[PDB]
Design a protein around this nucleic acid. Structure first.
Lengths: 122, 209, 114, 118, 55, 6
RNA sequence: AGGACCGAACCGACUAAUGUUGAAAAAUUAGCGGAUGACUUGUGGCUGGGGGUGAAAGGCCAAUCAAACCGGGAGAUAGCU
RNA sequence: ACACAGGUGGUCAGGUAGAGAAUACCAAGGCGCUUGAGAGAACUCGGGUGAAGGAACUAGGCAAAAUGGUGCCGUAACUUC
RNA sequence: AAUUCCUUGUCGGGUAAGUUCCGACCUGCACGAAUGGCGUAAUGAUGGCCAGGCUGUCUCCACCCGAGACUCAGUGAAAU
RNA sequence: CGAUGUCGGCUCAUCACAUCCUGGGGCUGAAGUAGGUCCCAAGGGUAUGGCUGUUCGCCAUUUAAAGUGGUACGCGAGCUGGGUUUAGAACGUCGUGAGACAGUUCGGUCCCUAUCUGCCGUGGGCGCUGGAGAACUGAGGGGGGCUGCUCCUAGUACGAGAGGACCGGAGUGGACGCAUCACUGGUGUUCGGGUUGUCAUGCCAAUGGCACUGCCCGGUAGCUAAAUGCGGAAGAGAUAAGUGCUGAAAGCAUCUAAGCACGAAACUUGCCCCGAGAUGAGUUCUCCCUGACCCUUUAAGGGUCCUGAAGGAACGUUGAAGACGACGACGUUGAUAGGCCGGGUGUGUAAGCGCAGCGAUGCGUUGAGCUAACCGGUACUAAUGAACCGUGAGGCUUAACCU
């Protein structure tokens, strides 16, 4: 349940420490973003040597949500802190070479298979 | 074909072996004994009249008791009628059991929903509440405006306003029938059917198939 | 009624081990990746048990690599395989959400030794 | 919307409602019959019958529980010395509601509540 | 929130047509004392269903 | 006095 | 020491909600400002209508104020209703 | 104008905690506020809590939420020192 | 600019985006030196803006607790 | 002008079509993808923020698309009150001045208990031609009608290559709506526990009152959304723009004049709901009443006595039904409500007693004690015999049959 003006932690190491969601992409009037959802973000805090600089507008995918994900047996997986992986604007591939923290098995599709290959837990 | 009349007894969930937990509603579909067969001769249309359960011996009035004991059935709670689509015959007195849904794949369930009573427009019609701070005066969940001005000069019929919500007949359509248990007269459907636990449900095969 | 409890007793498993809040527990669950099925272990701390018969669940909290993960488990679902109660906790509450508040050395609990 | 709910509000908050039921249960136990309104008497049934249930098993913890419910030692004395042995064969239903006209002052439906001994 | 012109006595009586009191159908006769009382109410004499409960 | 049509 | 600080009584009246044929012809509730002073209050005096008084708003002068209230010119006058 | 939620000066002032005449609970003392009984709809009033988010609301962080005591450590620009 | 019409002047900062804010330039419609000019520490129930915390303000409302509204008995207005 | 409250925002809308998107076509300087332009089409949909009082606009990021208008520039007896438009004050300018400014700037009381129409719900009376209990047909009315992305065909058709489909299918989303709590949660001042201050129960222990539920921590049932199932359609008929077939008038040609077939989310149905007050008041099934006599203007008459039937209403216990009515269940030939019993659930190892220690406290008894609305049972208590209303075969005329 990431909406507009939600501050997200950043799972990869593109350089952003903390970003802000500015639109949940896909569909008109859409409210929220889950783990399998692309959003547009802007960067509020960056690392001084990183790739992305503070004040850029690009895209991310959510990887951890405090609202969680509900598996088909009814089980929920509620992380602590909302987290995203920064993607490119039109390439839609991750800008990081590594990924911190665990991610979710319901992210497993081709491009995010390239994401979860770097992931230490799925 | 026809439908069957059952009683809602709670919701449960079926754990299938692959992992997926199907949340089911249990419908105890008892034996429906046919009471009257309406045909083209007397009625100008063809339909059957069924009953289920059993009332007490003295609660049944004399007209109902004569109607039941006219043809071979014992008195149950309420009479119902299904409209017999062109080529099916059910003899008077025949108990119809639940394997009719052991044939079929999808089901629509008709019931009287739970009554919320006199509900306001925010609950009844999903109206957006007015701004709950910023100066608002006795007007948070009020409906707002209900008409334009002098040119209509009247509220149009079918205006969404506060009123009785619930306690009406609604039909939920195309539910997956999960299990037909003839040994305990259980019918289990996937999803939420209308009504409180105990209200009568009319269970038909799905027509939007 | 007698029907719903009957279907619940039909669905439930006969074997499920006895644990309480505070118990450090490994749960092993089935996962699928196409045709290939796999077992995966989740070791954490039981911080909530919701007893309802068939609908019983339990919440296991595990501090993963940097982060805090939390998973509820349907206790009678077939997606779980084993619940090995590794360590026994000595709390005196039934729900332990202050561990969701706490981190680190403040988030540890003494052993039961009943 | 009160579906499948119990407990009457009686136009009193929970402190007033609990204190009034404590006082009314003390009056019914002490006098063996009192006269009140009708819905107050029905909720008084729901209050005062678990005390006579508690009065059957005599123990120090039961005396202290019945003290926590009544806050009068005369009431727990009369309970555990009279209504414990008197109702020990009876299982449930120690009180009887009899409707007695209407109140003169405001036209309120009156009723007697008594124990089943008299 | 005020009337535009006065309502007639005709429209007054029509509204008060539903204000009419309903009398009780009948009272009961107790088995022993034989005095009249409401249904399911104790008598003014204190009898109820053949049983004196209150002096 | 905001109700007056000045 | 202080027209010093925090804060009760006390004096005030910044904001919001309620009240709007009010509980009240200016209040209540929760917060708010001053609170040893150019403070506040009791009691008694003095200033009176083109006059008083005014840390000045045309403010206040008995619920009345760009000239009070009462009685009198006076049945003013009204090309207006 | 009311048996009116307003106004009105001085004197006395106990306990426990508290810096305190604050505030909480009590004493002496005095009251339950001159319509009540049910029910437990919309909506309005006074509140309590709220997943995920956290000013995206709005003229405006208005209102609510939060901060809040004592002791010690520590404390920047600027300054009329 | 409490002054500036044209006008949201133009440039820079803050913002993903800033007719308001901050710093500048002067083209001052129509500043300007006791009807004072320009700075100014402290103050302010003062006007404008930004940040942290915090939140039902809001996304989007949900439930609960009391007082009215509702029903019953007594009394019993009002504008129009 | 003995008053028609005005800009913007909010809430709620509704219509027109001069159509933004979706739908169907003609022409193209239409190879494809994508466009352009024009015709038909109103069923549904038609952003969120920054700035500004703003509408508008500019910008950012989307979307299938972010339509143009009417409705007192819809909407203040529905809310706000930023602008504007009272009284204070100030700036610039004009004036000797009082003052003034479609020039700014700061601040500044938004009243009303709904009689009638209208609308949303909900009943009482009477009618429907003897009365009653049910089940329906269905005139009519209402609701719903949105759409993306990915895959397959197929990287084929087309195209130098870049690129890249029509038609048809399958899945998975967004927004919307209905339903329900099985799950995930919220609430849970009626359940359990911790804990601060104080008062009381004589005191210790243990409890209780008050302090916003004192502050808190979990939480049953209900209710609910963020949770979970479902749905928009496929199909049919008649069409619009358009496309044709045969075909004369006009020996040819020609979609039209005679005739025939296609053709859209629009129209009528199909789906869901209300629905015989549909006064045109319908249909079917069942039950119930099978008495004597008087009077007078012997009339669809009035009266007396006896019987009150089916059934209804009242009364009570009440309900996941409810403002009140209504609706549903039950009334002892009985599980309707309370209690009681067992379980479930919640909280976390009660009180007393024993032991350890100087004591706070710990351990054993002990996953104890207490458990609201849940579940299955149980007549222990209250649902009293009854009385009340409702009658006694139900008009005339004509037709077709049967004694």
């Amino acid at each position: 349940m990431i909406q507009e003006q939600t501050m997200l932690n950043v799972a990869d190491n593109s350089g952003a420490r903390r970003v802000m969601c500015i639109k949940v992409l896909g569909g008109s009037h859409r409210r929220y973003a889950g783990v399998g959802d692309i959003i547009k973000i802007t960067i509020k805090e960056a690392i001084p040597r990183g790739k992305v600089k503070k004040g850029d507008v690009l895209k991310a995918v959510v990887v951890r949500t405090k609202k969680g994900v509900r598996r088909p047996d009814g089980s929920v997986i509620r992380f602590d802190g909302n987290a995203c992986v920064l993607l490119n604007n039109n390439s839609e591939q991750p800008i990081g070479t590594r990924i911190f923290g665990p991610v979710t098995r319901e992210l497993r599709s081709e491009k995010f298979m390239k994401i979860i290959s770097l992931a230490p837990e799925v | 074909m026809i439908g069957l009349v059952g009683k809602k007894v709670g919701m449960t969930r079926i754990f299938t072996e692959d992992g997926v937990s199907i949340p089911v509603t249990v419908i105890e579909v008892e034996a429906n004994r046919v009471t009257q067969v309406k045909d083209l001769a007397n009625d100008g249309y063809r339909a059957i009249q069924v009953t289920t359960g059993a009332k007490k011996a003295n609660r049944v009035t004399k007209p109902e008791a004569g109607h039941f004991a006219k043809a071979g059935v014992e008195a149950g709670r309420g009479l119902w009628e299904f409209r017999l689509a062109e080529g099916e015959e059910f003899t008077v007195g025949q108990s119809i059991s639940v394997e009719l849904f052991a044939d079929v794949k999808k089901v629509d369930v008709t019931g009287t929903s739970k009554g919320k009573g006199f509900a306001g427009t925010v609950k009844r019609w999903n109206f957006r509440t007015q701004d709950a701070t910023h100066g608002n005066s006795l007007s948070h969940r009020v409906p707002g405006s209900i008409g334009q001005n002098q040119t209509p000069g009247k509220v149009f019929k079918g205006k969404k306003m506060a009123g009785q919500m619930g306690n009406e007949r609604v039909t939920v359509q195309s539910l997956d029938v999960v299990r037909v248990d003839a040994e305990r007269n259980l019918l289990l459907v996937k999803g939420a059917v209308p009504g409180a636990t105990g209200s009568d449900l009319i269970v038909k095969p799905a027509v939007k198939a | 009624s007698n029907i719903i409890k009957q279907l619940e007793q039909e669905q439930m498993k006969q074997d499920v081990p006895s644990f309480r809040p505070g118990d450090t527990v490994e749960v092993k669950v089935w996962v699928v990746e196409g045709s290939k099925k796999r077992l995966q272990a989740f070791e954490g701390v039981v911080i909530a048990i919701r007893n309802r018969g068939l609908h019983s669940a339990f919440t296991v909290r595990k501090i993963s690599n940097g982060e805090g993960v939390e998973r509820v488990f349907q206790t009678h679902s077939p997606v779980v395989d084993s619940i090995s109660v590794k360590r026994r906790g000595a709390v005196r509450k039934a729900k332990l959400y202050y561990l969701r508040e706490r981190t680190g050395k403040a988030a540890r609990i003494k052993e039961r030794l009943n | 919307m009160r579906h499948r709910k119990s407990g009457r509000q009686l136009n009193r908050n929970s402190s007033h409602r609990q204190a009034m039921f404590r006082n009314m249960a003390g009056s019914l136990v002490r006098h063996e019959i009192i006269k009140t309104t009708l819905p107050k008497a029905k909720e008084l049934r729901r209050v005062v019958e678990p005390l006579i249930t508690l009065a059957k098993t005599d123990s120090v913890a039961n005396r202290r529980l019945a003290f926590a419910r009544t806050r009068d030692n005369e009431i727990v004395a009369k309970l555990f010395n009279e209504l414990g042995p008197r109702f020990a064969s009876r299982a449930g239903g120690y009180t009887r509601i009899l409707k007695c006209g209407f109140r003169a002052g405001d036209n309120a439906p009156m009723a007697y509540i008594e124990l089943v001994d008299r | 929130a005020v009337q535009q012109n006065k309502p007639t006595r005709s429209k007054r009586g029509m509204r008060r047509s539903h204000d009419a009191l309903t009398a009780v159908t009948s009272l009961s006769v107790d088995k022993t004392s034989g005095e009249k009382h409401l249904r399911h109410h104790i008598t003014a004499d204190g009898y109820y269903r053949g049983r004196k409960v209150i002096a | 006095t905001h109700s007056m049509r000045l």
